[PDB]
From a paper:
In Saccharomyces cerevisiae, cryptic transcription at the coding region is prevented by the activity of Sin3 histone deacetylase (HDAC) complex Rpd3S, which is carried by the transcribing RNA polymerase II (RNAPII) to deacetylate and stabilize chromatin. Rpd3S utilizes the conserved Sin3 basic surface to bind to the nucleosomal DNA positions at SHL + 2, SHL + 5, and SHL + 7, under the conditions involving different H3K36me3–CHD interactions and DNA linker interactions.
Having understood the structural mechanism of deacetylation by Rpd3S, we created an Rpd3S–NCP187bp complex that mimics a stage when the nucleosome is deacetylated and Rpd3S is no longer activated by methylation. 3D classification of the Rpd3S–NCP187bp complex results in two Rpd3S binding states. One is identical to the SHL + 2 state and another novel state that we termed the linker tightening state. In the linker tightening state, Rpd3S rotates around the nucleosomal DNA axis by ~150° with the Sin3 conserved basic surface binding to the nucleosomal DNA at the SHL + 7 position. This rotation makes the Rpd3S main body leaving the nucleosomal disc entirely, with MRGA-PHDA and MRGB-PHDB arms interacting with the entry and exit DNA linkers. The position of Rpd3S in the linker tightening state, which is created without H3K36MLA, further reinforces the notion that the interaction between Eaf3 CHDs and H3K36MLA is the key factor in maintaining Rpd3S on the nucleosomal disc and hence the ability of Rpd3S to sample and target histone tails within proximity. This indicates that Rpd3S further tightens the exit DNA linker post deacetylation. Collectively, our results indicate that following deacetylation and absence of constraints from H3K36me3, Rpd3S disengages from the nucleosomal disc while maintaining its interactions with the DNA linkers, which are in turn tightened.
Author numbering:
A (entry chain S), H (entry chain O): 38 to 133
B (entry chain Q), F (entry chain U): 11 to 117
C (entry chain R): 29 to 119
D (entry chain T): 24 to 100
E (entry chain V): 29 to 120
G (entry chain P): 22 to 100
């Protein structure tokens, strides 16, 4: 069978997910997570669909920027993989 | 008597001076509001909107389409230096990111 | 209550810039949010400038200083040029 | 259980949008945790905004104000 | 006009907390700047909360929401309890 | 009539409720300010000042000086976690930083 | 007077790094931190001089400087 | 010629400059640099002493925080010596 080298499929995924702005995170798990988080602060709390969309967009953009900083730190450390220490360093510099 | 010349048409400016003045007055940001302050704010807003829309239309032209959609706006914001610096802490929905690949990532 | 919208204003600005380029409803909302955010930022900076020297009024100079503080570089210079041209056309 | 509701391929796609070639196996839990912290902060701000208005449903509008008061303003809503 | 300053109020708070220990004028300026900055932050949050709800007044609920928002963690509920205690003492 | 009572005794606090109401009215945040809003503001400011001064006095006790120094205030601010996230983007003059050294740097 | 970027001496940079907990300080970082200190200074100074020119003011006061620092989200206490 | 180790005096200076709050950049060169930078904006501009003081405090605090971030980047990259790439990474993470 045909075999692809490690990286070209990754680069193709990078390209195809950077040209388009589709919703990477599925609607239902993010909505369920939002309801679970909000249920500890206020019981019987509702969320309109556009509110869930907006929160999902903000979360996805924030996580994309955090992953960009994580990859940046990984390249600074001469590393291709991204480690949780990279995320910790990026958040510490960003003060999060 | 004479016909109404309005406010925005007197200055030759498309953005509403009257709406900006009403928002500034109802926003209680100052006890008094000058006459030229809404004119200046509307002019600055129109310039910024025109620059953003021009860059977004250019990006759509590179996208082989003639309708501006928010990915084009995000590309226009992030591509130009001054608007990216102005909107650095600003997130655009349905926009994605710049299609850039690091040097070490490419084979 | 009713909610204001800048659909016609951004529409006519776009047709003045590109006469043959459309815009989507989501992009209309993005533009509205952008213009309102810039309006709030400039108005807050101008109000802070007025309160800074015990001034109870906001004039064109307050918006000028707010634009120079917020907008960077050549964007700020072109904004001041456009605002000055608008005020001179008014008078 | 909804914290694990988000999927590992979703996190992979999120990193792909961030221009990351490869992802380590133990960073998924850390990304989930920091996402939980960020969502907790934003949801707390939105809950305070909703409770201030004597409202029982979190609209989209106070969510974008909650994000904007954190230096993460959202456009399109 | 008269320049605002919380010098004696900060000093009285220090004496009711640490009566033996004093405070310096550089530290006094730092405390005055902190009090002023927190006051402006909370007042701006209350004003924006009133504007977003189409409200033309700032009440105790505005301050409660502002200190729930800007102040994080245990400080939020502690300031909420202090404000509620002050409100009840005012009403009594 | 009866003797006038100051707001400090009425609200059981030390920060000036009258001054806070004065800067709220003259600071044009809203066209109206409620009665309990300056009281709540004075209470919150008084509690924050009390907590910061208590932590500064504790830091001075660990240093044995009887006078609060801007270094003591900086140590008090950056030692408490909630004060650290509240005052994270805030500069304190003549305060320095915490003396933290990484384990790999120490021999 | 020009060429005052050399006023921030290398030992002053070393002291600033020691306050930051830096053990080993490269010889090539001094130019870079002079550049970033210069850039931060032009940003804060341009905000301060816009504040000064707004109020018909000719001498830059400490108040405007700390107000500029706060509007860049870097508020300074003690002035 | 008793000589200390290259890295013990470094830690001693770190402790000394972290415990003390005395300023590190001399006032006259910083004032001259501030005047040089401001002379390109406003001709014949005057700086009061407290303005230069506050500017110096803010500048040293920003440089110190950036130095902690670059040091953390150095340890994250399994390194001790800071390099200008660490400063560039720290600046780009915060978007400066």
């Amino acid at each position: 069978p045909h075999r692809y080298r490690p990286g070209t499929v990754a680069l193709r995924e990078i390209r195809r997910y950077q040209k388009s702005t589709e919703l990477l995170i599925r609607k239902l798990p993010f909505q369920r997570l939002v309801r679970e988080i909000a249920q500890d602060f206020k019981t019987d709390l509702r969320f309109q669909s556009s509110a869930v969309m907006a929160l999902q967009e903000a979360s996805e953009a924030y996580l994309v920027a955090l992953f960009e900083d994580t990859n940046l730190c990984a390249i600074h450390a001469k590393r291709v993989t991204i480690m949780p220490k990279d995320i910790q360093l990026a958040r510490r510099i960003r003060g999060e | 008597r004479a016909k109404a010349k309005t406010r925005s048409s007197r200055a030759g400016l498309q953005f509403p001076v009257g709406r900006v003045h009403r928002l500034l007055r109802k926003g209680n940001y100052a006890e008094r509001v000058g006459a030229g302050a809404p004119v200046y704010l509307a002019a600055v807003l129109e310039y910024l909107t025109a620059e953003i829309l021009e860059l977004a239309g250019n990006a759509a032209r590179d996208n082989k389409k003639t309708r501006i959609i928010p990915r084009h706006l995000q590309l226009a914001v992030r591509n130009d230096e001054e608007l990216n610096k102005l909107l650095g802490r600003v997130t655009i929905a349905q926009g994605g990111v710049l299609p850039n690949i690091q040097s070490v990532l490419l084979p | 209550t009713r909610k204001e919208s800048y659909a016609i204003y951004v529409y006519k600005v776009l047709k003045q810039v590109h006469p043959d380029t459309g815009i989507s409803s989501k992009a209309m909302s993005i533009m509205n949010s952008f213009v309102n955010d810039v309006f709030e930022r400039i108005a807050g900076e101008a109000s802070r400038l007025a309160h800074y020297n015990k001034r109870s009024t906001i004039t064109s100079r307050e918006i000028q200083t707010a634009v120079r503080l917020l907008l960077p570089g050549e964007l700020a210079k072109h904004a001041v040029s456009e605002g000055t041209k608008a005020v001179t056309k008014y008078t | 259980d909804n914290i694990q509701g988000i999927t590992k391929p979703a996190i992979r796609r999120l990193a792909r949008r961030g221009g990351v070639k490869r992802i380590s196996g133990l960073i998924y839990e850390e990304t989930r945790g920091v996402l939980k912290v960020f969502l907790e902060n934003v949801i707390r701000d939105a809950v305070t905004y909703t409770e201030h208005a004597k409202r029982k449903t979190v609209t989209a509008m106070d969510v974008v104000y909650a994000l904007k008061r954190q230096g993460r303003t959202l456009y399109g809503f």
